Amino acid sequence: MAHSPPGHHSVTGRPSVNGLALAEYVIYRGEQAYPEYLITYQIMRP
Amino acid sequence: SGTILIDLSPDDKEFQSVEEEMQSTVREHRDGGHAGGIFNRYNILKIQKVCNKKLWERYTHRRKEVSEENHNHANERMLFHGSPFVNAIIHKGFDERHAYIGGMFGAGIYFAENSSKSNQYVYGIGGGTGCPVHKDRSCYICHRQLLFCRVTLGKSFLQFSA
Numbered sequence: 750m751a752h753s754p755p756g757h758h759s760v761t762g763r764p765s766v767n768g769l770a771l772a773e774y775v776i777y778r779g780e781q782a783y784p785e786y787l788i789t790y791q792i793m794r795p
Numbered sequence: 796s797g798t799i800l801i802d803l804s805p806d807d808k809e810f811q812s813v814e815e816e817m818q819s820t821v822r823e824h825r826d827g828g829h830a831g832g833i834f835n836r837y838n839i840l841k842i843q844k845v846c847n848k849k850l851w852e853r854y855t856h857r858r859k860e861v862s863e864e865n866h867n868h869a870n871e872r873m874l875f876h877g878s879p880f881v882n883a884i885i886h887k888g889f890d891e892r893h894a895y896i897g898g899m900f901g902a903g904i905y906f907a908e909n910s911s912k913s914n915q916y917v918y919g920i921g922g923g924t925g926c927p928v929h930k931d932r933s934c935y936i937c938h939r940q941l942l943f944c945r946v947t948l949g950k951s952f953l954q955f956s957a
């Protein structure tokens with residue numbers, strides 16, 4: 750696992766071509782996330 | 796491990812607000828459904844609260860350290876995470892073994908605002924070979940699992956991604 754850029758705790762991937770896409774995020778320390786909900790699902794055929 | 800899973804009732808406001816975030820953040824993907832399958836919505840079968848005192852205290856300790864480095868602002872978000880290692884994460888927490896070595900922003904742990912983005916990683920990088928039963932990345936039968944996670948961003952480095 751790499752380090753976050755100096756002076757930063759995470760990276761934000763800002764959508765920059767796809768106008769509809771939401772952001773993605775990267776942390777470099779496992780302690781900075783807690784898995785609060787487990788969602789069991791199926792994708793639905795349109 | 797110390798982890799218990801508590802089932803939420805569909806009548807519980809917490810079940811309903813987590814389901815809405817899952818359903819409302821589906822988008823179309825540039826791969827036309829290659830990785831995660833073709834769909835506009837989910838059939839939610841179950842939502843469980845992940846309860847682990849030790850993992851929670853590990854998270855809140857780190858959150859206080861970040862907050863004190865960032866003018867008392869943790870910059871906490873609720874984000875999706877899809878992984879073949881979801882069962883190891885709920886028991887042992889996130890660590891370097893859950894990192895995406897080849898990710899666009901280097902070796903880290905990736906989260907998404909779009910539930911359908913996290914859905915692309917449930918069966919591995921690029922959807923791997925799809926469900927273990929039918930080898931189908933667009934399987935409509937097999938049960939899938941995602942995590943909805945509490946994530947401390949603190950001071951986040953902004954990468955514009957064209």
Ligand SMILES: O=c1[nH]c(-c2ccc(C(F)(F)F)cc2)nc2c([N+](=O)[O-])cccc12
Nearest residue numbers: 773876877878893895898905906907913916
């Ligand atoms: O929810 C997400 N999960 C994963 C992922 C990647 C690799 C692994 C594995 F190598 F351990 F198998 C496990 C999970 N990657 C994401 C990305 N991304 O582009 O990395 C963007 C947005 C969300 C996610």
Ligand SMILES: [Zn+2]
Nearest residue numbers: 926929934937
């Ligand atoms: Zn299947």
